């Protein structure tokens, strides 16, 4: 049959090692690692969660350059916990004036058709965030971020977020 | 420049809860304050009322009115408004400026969604509850 | 001296008429009789400065409410 | 002598094409080529204009006006500029004017903004000009900024903000019309002489008023003339109004067969017959689209202002003859108007309008350019027009509201030398 | 502390207040100060209270009393008028002859929203906005 | 985000002065020059005295005769020296200067006190390199 | 031979070469010094400031006509230091006649505008000097120097 030519989610040809090693749950999850430009992928292959409450999560900044408040975002990733640690899932908008480290105060949270078994985490999806600020000085962000009341163990894998902010052309040789 | 958005924001709330006559009927400071939410053909009410918190006095005594500037708007809404419906709530508003704009004749019409996100922080530093007030019903008619 | 459009023997007399209105399908909407004529004259080839070259533009609505 | 100079020029090509947008309410300039005293100047603009994919399909047009002034560089740099010709090779260059950082922040001038935020005034003020005489409501008050600085994003990225087409609301009796006069008096006694010549007095004011306004129009008033320029009127040269309309474009599959979405596609010539450059200077030639105002909420003055009186339904000539403004509101035209904002209406004038009518059922829909809810600000914020009004019809603004191909066909018959001497020196 | 835009006034008004006095009567400090609502009939009464302390806060500090400052007459109505009265008071303010809003050099009159901005902000100093009889 | 040549060329004042210390001023003087306490109707000569005297500097310090400061420099020195308290007295002081631009342009536009005030206000919020020095302290 | 008389200034500087100009090494101290000119000092002052103007222009082949203000501030704002500019103005301000140049062309300059185009120059804002090169370069190819 015909190939299919349609993803909720593109990911970016180039992928980041996360540097950082120990992760420890919060209420004030901590962002993973600096969040770049508009599309990243980020992937782990040791990644020890200090037990405590809370999340960490993952982000791409908004890029603001094309007229259009409603744009869509997409997160691609698969995640493997050592242990299962019953938590959810979802993707977070929250804006900052400043490079965040932490998921701040006030955020915003949606659903992601994801799917779960045990301590694994496998997810392709996209959904539309205002990515205008709402607030003059910020810069809005949105990521991925699992939340549970963990308890310390180790998760591998990876992944990647996405800004539909322009197309990315791929070859379909009947074209 | 936000400190002090919020800061006006608050004052707004002492400026209001002082407000000498509510030109609201009884009912009508329910659609506006009860917990059943708005359906979109009630926004124009909500708009009055929501309106009438903020031009008060002025319409009953006979001044004409003219624009609050937002901070106000928001502490009003944050204040009388039920959580259930701050939100159309917000987007019936949307369109006056910051105080800062105003002040400094730059026309930018501050869209829904910030009107929200500002009610909502006045909302959480508030502390001079309504319910606290119920006796404000008092100043609520024509007397 | 000057012509300006309009806002928003004899056989050959009547014949350059026709050929001022022409024009004023083409340069808009209408012309004062006496422009209208010099309007006829004009020679799209003569690069040397023709009188029909001189005209303003008159629009009904600014000049009775004063703005577009 | 210069003598036979009044003729022999070669005709140059200053013909190019630009690809452009704009938001919906806003006078944008489209292209601005410099003449020099003595060229004659010739356009012949044609190309498409269109709206966004609009999210529902084809419902109400919009009007589309192509203007293009003349503004001789005396009434910018004036006088500075006397003296400039006057000196020559010697003078001190003409002035600048800055802009804000931004790409698109010279925009409304039909320039990218250059590397330094510096544009000749004239580009400027020749605007500024233009706005304040043509397309502001003369009520309203001059538009004064020194260089766009001043400007908000909006206003200097976009073109600044015209006003609704003629309106019974939105083009009311200037906003202090009037609306009796008196003449002092003893306790016990009226001056019958005096009384004559307070009214001599209130006619002169009335028609000077209207009719008058400009040096020329009093001078003139005297059966002389005059060439007074200083008002700095600029020159308008040639508009053409289209109205600007395309084709649905039906729906066809499966989910979506009753759907469809509107292109607007319109073609259009705007042409400007050879006109006569007498000194140097700047020719703008800028665009304005406009939905009509129709709103989903107006009234018929008569079935809402409620309980109608003889004057009001009678439509006596002899009452509305000697009876001045009356001071409308808002709420009496208006399915929900702030009745604290009233303006002054022409006694008659109810019979002599007829509202455009949106039936409720469109009302609460999405995608139709009728005006939603009624304006709320003053008598010119209420006139003026917001733009984002009309996002809401658009599948994307992501090239503004209406964009439009176009090739500026322009030749210029001026006189510049050859490439001889030019370039051969010698 | 964009409070910064007010000291000036606002610590001019302290002082005047403390030691000397304005062009009041005791009664005319009253509509000015009360929390009677002001009514339509009122405005004048208002307005030549309202100026008053104007002018007085300017001549303590040396300031001439022409083009009143917008910064000052926000701090007094702001400092003076009850909160059941500030925005009609700003209303009156409106236009008013002295005041004289400059931007980019242009001398507009005093629009009512902005001054109740201003007012509104200048009220966010609420220590000293504790107006005591005695107390 | 804007860095207006107005802007910019206060900034580059502010600076101007750090360096340039010398004033003329007694101790006393740039007391309440500097001083939070607010000044009155009877000081205004006081105050322009020194408020001048920051922005003539050395010309004053030596015998030199004077030059009409572009406005962005009156700012920065009210914005630098005069605190808080006394910024907008210390304009109507100062009124009558023009901006840099209309210097330049031969459109004499001398800027009312209100603008003055504006623009040091504004000149004001590129606070950071606006950290004193007590060898300011150190000129009599 | 294109260098725009700003860069002459800059890179005459970063390197510092009075040698270029005409100023002993002490000279190019005393102008460039932090040590405030006194009355007395005046004249070498201006000796000084002039030397770098009618200098770096000839370090660039412009002939030389009497030199132009946006010129004279770059170089105020270049060499003299911040303590000396007001009176660094103040001293390029008259029309102090020298029969070693054209006062054919001699202009009064004028002090506070002289100040405020240096002021400016200082702040990062070059056109000023380029926009007037460019003047400079015309008036004399039409002049027939070039």
């Known amino acids: 049959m015909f190939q299919t030519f349609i993803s909720r989610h593109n990911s970016n040809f180039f992928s980041d090692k996360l540097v950082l090693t120990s992760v420890t749950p919060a209420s004030s999850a901590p962002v993973l690692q600096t969040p770049k430009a508009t599309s990243s992928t980020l992937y782990f292959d040791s ?31 698969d995640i493997a916990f050592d242990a299962d640690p019953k938590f959810f899932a979802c993707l977070v908008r929250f ?71 322009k197309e990315i052309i791929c070859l379909q040789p009947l074209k | 420049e936000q400190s002090v958005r919020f800061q006006t924001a608050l004052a707004s709330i002492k400026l209001i809860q002082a407000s000498a006559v509510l030109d609201l009927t009884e009912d009508d400071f329910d659609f506006l304050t009860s917990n059943k939410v708005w359906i979109a053909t009630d926004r124009s009410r909500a708009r009055r009322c929501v309106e009438a918190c903020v031009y008060g006095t002025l319409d009953f005594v006979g001044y004409p009115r003219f624009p609050a500037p937002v901070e106000f708007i928001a502490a009003v809404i944050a204040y009388y408004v039920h959580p259930v419906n701050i939100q159309t709530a917000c987007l019936i508003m949307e369109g006056a400026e910051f105080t800062e704009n105003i002040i400094n004749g730059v026309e930018r019409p501050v869209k829904a969604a910030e009107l929200f996100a500002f009610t909502l922080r006045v909302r959480a530093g508030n502390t001079d509850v309504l319910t606290d007030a119920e006796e404000n019903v008092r100043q609520k008619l024509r007397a | 001296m000057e012509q300006l459009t309009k806002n928003q023997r004899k056989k050959r007399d009547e014949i350059e008429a026709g050929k001022s209105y022409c024009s004023r399908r083409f340069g808009g909407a209408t012309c004062d009789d006496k422009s209208a004529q010099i309007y006829a004259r004009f020679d799209k080839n003569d690069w040397r400065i023709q009188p029909a070259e001189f005209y303003r533009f008159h629009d009904a609505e600014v000049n009775t409410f004063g703005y577009f | 002598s210069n003598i036979q100079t009044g003729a022999e020029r070669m005709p140059h090509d200053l013909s190019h094409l630009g690809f452009l947008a704009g938001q919906i309410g806003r006078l944008i300039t489209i292209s601005t080529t410099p003449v020099i005293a003595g060229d004659s100047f010739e356009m012949d603009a044609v190309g498409a204009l269109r709206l966004s994919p609009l999210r529902r399909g084809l419902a109400i047009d919009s009007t589309v006006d192509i203007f293009t002034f003349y503004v001789p560089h005396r ?48 580009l400027f003020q020749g605007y500024l000009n ?59 006694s009226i001056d019958i ?9 209130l006619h002169t004011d009335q028609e000077r008023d209207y009719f008058m306004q400009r040096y020329r129009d009093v001078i003139s008033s005297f059966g002389g003339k005059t060439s007074y320029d200083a008002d700095n009127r600029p020159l308008l040269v040639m508009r053409s109004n289209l109205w600007a309309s395309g084709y649905d474009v039906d729906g066809t599959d499966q989910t979506s067969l009753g759907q469809f979405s509107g292109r607007v596609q319109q073609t259009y010539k705007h042409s400007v017959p050879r006109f006569f450059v007498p000194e140097h200077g700047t020719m703008f030639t800028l665009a304005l689209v406009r939905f009509p105002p129709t709103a989903t909420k107006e009234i018929q003055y008569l079935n809402a202002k409620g309980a109608l009186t003889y004057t009001d339904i009678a439509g006596d000539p002899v009452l509305y003859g000697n009876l001045p403004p009356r001071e409308i ?46 304006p709320s600000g003053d008598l010119q914020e209420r006139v003026l027009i917001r733009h984002h009004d009309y996002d809401q019809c658009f599948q994307s603004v992501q090239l503004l509201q209406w964009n439009s191909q176009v090739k500026f066909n322009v030749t210029v018959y001026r006189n510049l030398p050859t490439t001889r001497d030019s370039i051969m020196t010698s």
């Open chain 4, 329 to 374: 509101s808002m709420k009496d035209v208006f399915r929900s108007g702030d009745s604290s904002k009233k303006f002054k209406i022409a006694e008659g004038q109810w019979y002599r309008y007829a509202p455009s009518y949106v039936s409720p059922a469109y009302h609460l829909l999405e995608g139709f350019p009728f005006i939603q809810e009624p």
């Open chain 4, 75 to 122: 009434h910018v740099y004036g006088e500075q500029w006397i003296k400039f010709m006057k000196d020559g090779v010697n003078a001190t260059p003409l002035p600048t004017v800055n802009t804000t950082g931004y790409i698109d922040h010279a925009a409304f001038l039909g320039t990218i903004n250059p590397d330094t935020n510096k544009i000749p005034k004239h």
């Open chain 4, 193 to 201: 002489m005096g009384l004559q010549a307070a009214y001599a007095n």
């Open chain 1, 47 to 77: 990644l020890t969660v200090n037990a405590g409450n809370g999340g960490f999560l993952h982000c791409i900044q908004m890029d603001t350059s094309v007229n259009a408040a409603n744009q869509v975002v997409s997160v691609g990733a």
């Open chain 1, 95 to 165: 804006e900052s004036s400043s490079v965040p480290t932490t998921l701040p105060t006030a955020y915003d949270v949606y659903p992601l058709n994801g799917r779960h078994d045990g301590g694994y985490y496998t997810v392709k999806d996209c959904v539309t965030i205002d990515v205008l600020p709402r607030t003059p000085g910020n810069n809005v962000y949105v990521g991925f971020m699992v939340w549970s009341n963990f308890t310390a163990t180790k998760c591998r894998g990876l992944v990647s977020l996405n800004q539909v902010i």
């Open chain 4, 130 to 188: 233009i706005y304040n005489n043509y397309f502001k409501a003369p009520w309203m008050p001059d538009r004064t900024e020194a260089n766009p600085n001043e400007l908000n994003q909006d206003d200097a990225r976009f073109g600044f903000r015209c006003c609704h087409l003629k309106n019974i609301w939105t083009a009311p009796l200037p906003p202090e019309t009037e609306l009796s006069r008196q003449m002092t008096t003893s306790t016990t």
